[PDB]
Design an enzyme around this catalytic site. Structure first.
Site, mmCIF file in Angstrom:
data_model
loop_
_atom_site.group_PDB
_atom_site.id
_atom_site.type_symbol
_atom_site.label_atom_id
_atom_site.label_comp_id
_atom_site.label_asym_id
_atom_site.label_seq_id
_atom_site.Cartn_x
_atom_site.Cartn_y
_atom_site.Cartn_z
ATOM 1 N N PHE A 224 0.809 -1.209 0.000
ATOM 2 C CA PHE A 224 0.000 0.000 0.000
ATOM 3 C C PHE A 224 0.851 1.270 0.000
ATOM 4 O O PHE A 224 0.338 2.371 0.196
ATOM 5 C CB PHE A 224 -1.010 0.019 1.161
ATOM 6 C CG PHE A 224 -0.456 -0.404 2.488
ATOM 7 C CD1 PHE A 224 0.787 0.040 2.926
ATOM 8 C CD2 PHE A 224 -1.210 -1.224 3.326
ATOM 9 C CE1 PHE A 224 1.272 -0.329 4.181
ATOM 10 C CE2 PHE A 224 -0.741 -1.599 4.581
ATOM 11 C CZ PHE A 224 0.505 -1.151 5.010
ATOM 12 N N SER A 238 -8.351 -0.816 7.873
ATOM 13 C CA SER A 238 -8.740 -1.467 9.122
ATOM 14 C C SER A 238 -7.528 -1.957 9.911
ATOM 15 O O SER A 238 -6.823 -2.863 9.474
ATOM 16 C CB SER A 238 -9.678 -2.639 8.805
ATOM 17 O OG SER A 238 -9.849 -3.515 9.901
ATOM 18 N N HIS A 242 -2.377 2.551 12.801
ATOM 19 C CA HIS A 242 -1.689 2.499 14.085
ATOM 20 C C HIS A 242 -0.486 1.553 14.093
ATOM 21 O O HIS A 242 0.227 1.467 15.086
ATOM 22 C CB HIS A 242 -2.674 2.183 15.231
ATOM 23 C CG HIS A 242 -3.339 0.846 15.136
ATOM 24 N ND1 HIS A 242 -4.644 0.641 15.532
ATOM 25 C CD2 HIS A 242 -2.860 -0.368 14.779
ATOM 26 C CE1 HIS A 242 -4.939 -0.642 15.429
ATOM 27 N NE2 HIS A 242 -3.873 -1.278 14.976
#
Ligand SMILES: C[S@@+](CC[C@H](N)C(=O)[O-])C[C@H]1O[C@@H](n2cnc3c(N)ncnc32)[C@H](O)[C@@H]1O
Ligand SMILES: C[S@@+](CC[C@H](N)C(=O)[O-])C[C@H]1O[C@@H](n2cnc3c(N)ncnc32)[C@H](O)[C@@H]1O
Ligand SMILES: Cc1cccc2c(C(=O)O)c(O)ccc12
Ligand SMILES: Cc1cccc2c(C(=O)O)c(O)ccc12
EC number: 2.1.1.303
Lengths: 325, 325
Positions: A224, A238, A242
């Site tokens: 990504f 999702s 973090h």
């Protein structure tokens, strides 16, 4: 946490004892009829005297029972150690699972607090993702784990938001497709694609194939950090931001911004600060990532040319919707 | 009992965070006026954001407090982290001290439960004693710690037994002479000898010399696995036997039996099982040691040609008086 005594508050013997119990499946051996230290040890392949000493400590901790004959049993509490227990917590503590292994990296917390860098590499000599990327088995356990985290924290996320309206959803870092599968099962005219590394992607594929969703669900092996399949209605992140520091987090959001253009929505779904300080330290020691607040996500979004326009809490986590600035 | 949830019970983030705080001296920096994450981090040499995240976790745990302006303060509990605190618990958790370092060996508990062998080596590539034997500083911290454990558990051990009647006691593995020094101070006509390895022995010597006890207290560098100075009235084994496995513990007791002959008395002084499980697992992980019960000590004594004649409890510890069969 009350007033234990600093020394007891910093005890490692107990949590490690639980982790070792989990790894040896002692509870499951007990249920299968092995109750003496000798039997359990034989069944688990452990040193008898040492195992017995471990059990005596866990009896004290309150997970096991022990009668004058040396017969061990489980307690209401110790039941949660059984691999078939409903809450499925045993696999998370198993020193063989990705997270049961990763958590031992906490023994190097000092390095993290000192440098701001992840501790995991200090212990295992390589990054977390690199470690999974070269050990399919380890990587599979992680996928199963993230899959379980979905049932735990995202129950009914399908209705808590208007997915169907998106048309096509790209799950960036979508793991083995557990979430996409859920979205598509609840919205029959919706289609999507899981974008992840080889391991999870292949797993996502196996799942869609076996589930009869290949007609609407596809996977793409990629990073990504590189261009994403463009033009989808929405891009989902999702439990992914973090896991990264600020710099990498914007890089990721940036790629979603571009893929989504002026008509796409970027949906960050994770435990927003407000999701304890324990998970935050885990992100720090694992990847040098961090739990962020809506404000902090807002900042990242700004750097990637996006803006938060909504934030719907859904149990343990929240869905923060971002769109082009 | 102490229920919270299985994953919480196996938590490593908190105990590790407490240990890192102890090591970084956060409590003391705060008492010294550094109250923001930036100041404390600067004083401790830590990464600001990271240290801040550690502190936030610890205020949650209950050791610190934080005002809306980012000013941290201690709590009734977090006071125990101050180095000048009366309970002196901080040094035990400091990752630089012998025990704060040894405890991290708990991440290798599995190896111990699996083989019955110490875990410390797995982590540090050498035995505990070898480690101290080649690092005088590390070894000094250990001596200080054992010295502190005397004040905690041996309060008033001088009157609890008729030492004076012994004439001359040899403290086998007597460390830096803290115990012998207390015995000789309470009994003026008593004389003794501390037998330990170079490090502890030299420190005992420095202590006796500096406190005006060299006239009655002498040191002897040596291994209690080899012959001991013979003919003393009593031979003390304080917190020694639980540091060894059965074979070694018996070897040690033999040397004491032989030295004491038919006229001397061997005095094993330690926390007998029934301190508890926590210490027992530490002994296992540090050196494959073992907390023993009066019955189990009696068994060892038998193999060494001795027999338990008395057992006086005194606070946490007990004095097991053994004599030649
Ligand atoms: C928190 S995990 C699982 C996230 C998943 N959406 C879930 O909630 O189950 C983070 C995901 O990011 C994936 N990942 C890590 N690095 C990646 C990269 N460079 N490109 C794409 N995916 C990556 C990991 O393989 C993992 O599947
Ligand atoms: C747990 S400490 C106890 C010190 C002191 N007796 C006390 O109670 O505070 C164990 C002692 O055994 C000493 N020791 C270890 N191996 C030894 C050996 N082979 N011969 C003699 N002493 C040894 C260590 O140096 C240490 O001083
Ligand atoms: C490594 C890692 C990545 C993402 C999530 C988690 C979670 C989670 O999302 O609950 C954990 O509990 C533990 C480790 C995790
Ligand atoms: C390594 C070690 C050796 C002897 C004693 C101890 C004690 C003690 O005697 O209290 C500890 O609490 C921790 C570690 C210890």
């Amino acid at each position: 946490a009350a007033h234990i005594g600093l020394r007891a508050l910093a005890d490692l013997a107990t949590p490690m004892a639980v982790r070792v119990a989990a790894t040896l499946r002692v509870a499951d051996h007990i249920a299968a009829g092995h109750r003496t230290a000798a039997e359990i040890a034989s069944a688990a392949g452990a040193h008898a005297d040492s195992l017995d000493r471990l059990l005596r400590h866990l009896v004290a901790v309150g997970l096991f029972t022990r009668d004058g004959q040396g017969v061990y049993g489980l307690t209401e509490f110790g039941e949660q150690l059984r691999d078939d227990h409903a809450a499925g917590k045993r696999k998370w503590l198993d020193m063989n699972s990705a997270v049961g292994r990763g958590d031992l990296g906490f023994v190097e917390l000092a390095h993290s607090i000192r440098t701001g860098q992840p501790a995991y590499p200090v212990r295992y000599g390589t990054s977390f993702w690199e470690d999974l990327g070269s050990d399919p088995v380890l990587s599979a356990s992680f996928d199963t784990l993230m899959s379980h985290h979905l049932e735990l924290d995202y129950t009914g996320i399908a209705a808590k938001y208007d997915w169907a309206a998106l048309g096509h959803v790209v799950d960036v870092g979508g793991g083995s497709g557990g979430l996409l599968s859920a979205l598509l099962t609840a919205h029959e005219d919706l289609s999507g694609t899981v974008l992840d590394l080889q391991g999870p992607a292949s797993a996502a594929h196996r799942r869609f194939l076996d589930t009869g969703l290949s007609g609407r669900a596809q996977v793409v092996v990629g990073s990504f950090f590189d261009p994403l399949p463009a033009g989808a209605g929405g891009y989902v992140l999702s439990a992914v931001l973090h896991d990264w520091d600020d710099l990498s987090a914007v890089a990721i959001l940036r790629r979603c911004a571009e893929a989504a253009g002026s008509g796409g929505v970027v949906l960050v779904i994770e435990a927003v600060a407000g999701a304890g300080t324990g998970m935050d330290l885990r992100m720090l020691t694992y990847f040098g990532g961090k739990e962020r607040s809506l404000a902090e996500l807002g900042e990242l979004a700004a750097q990637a040319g996006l803006a938060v326009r909504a934030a719907h809490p859904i149990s343990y986590v929240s869905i923060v919707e971002m769109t082009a600035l």
